[PDB]
Each structure stands twice: as C-alpha cells, then as structure tokens.
Amino acid sequence: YEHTATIPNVVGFPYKAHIERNGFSPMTLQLEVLGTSLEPTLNLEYITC
Amino acid sequence: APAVTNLECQVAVCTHSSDFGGIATLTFKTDKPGKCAVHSHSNVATIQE
Numbered sequence A: 001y002e003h004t005a006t007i008p009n010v011v012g013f014p015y016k017a018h019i020e021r022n023g024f025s026p027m028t029l030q031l032e033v034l035g036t037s038l039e040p041t042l043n044l045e046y047i048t049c
Numbered sequence B: 001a002p003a004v005t006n007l008e009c010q011v012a013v014c015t016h017s018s019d020f021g022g023i024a025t026l027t028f029k030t031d032k033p034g035k036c037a038v039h040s041h042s043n044v045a046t047i048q049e
Helices: none
Strands: A015-019 A027-031 B005-011 B024-029
Touching: none
Parallel strands: none
Antiparallel strands: A015 A027, B005 B024
C-alpha cells in the first residue's frame, strides 16, 4: 500500500499521519524527528598556522 | 418451521474482488432456533454456503 505525507522540520514534534483504505480499520502513524545534520561539500583551499 | 420476521440487512465493505468482495449482515426476529436456507433472487451477486 502507498501513502505520502509532509512533516514540519522542528525537532521533538510528534506528527501523526492517517491511513484509510477500504476493507480495513483506519490506522495512524507517528513520525518524530530526533536530529538533523547538514554537512557542506568541503574542499580545503588552504590551511593556516 | 421456525418463523422469521423483520428481516433487514446492512453493508460493510463491497469491493469488486473476484472471489467474495463483501460481507452482509442480516438481523431478524424468531421464537426458536433451527435450520434454514438462503438464496438470492438476482444475478448481480451470489451468496455463499
């Protein structure tokens, strides 16, 4: 089965997504982000001492 | 023969699957239990057992 959603980016914020289909009970999900890094794509121009 | 009165139905799912895509539910009023037989007077759907 397929389903899409969008969650806001704030940390420590449990989001609920709802799934409905014919022939089954409805069901809810619980997505909750716990951390997020952002590494740039480096290259050392130089180094200084 | 046990008398059966006030016979109604309600619909649960009704999908178009090939085998048996729906479950009906029938309530009535009687006086003593026993054995009966069911049948559908149409060709749109067929009932089992």
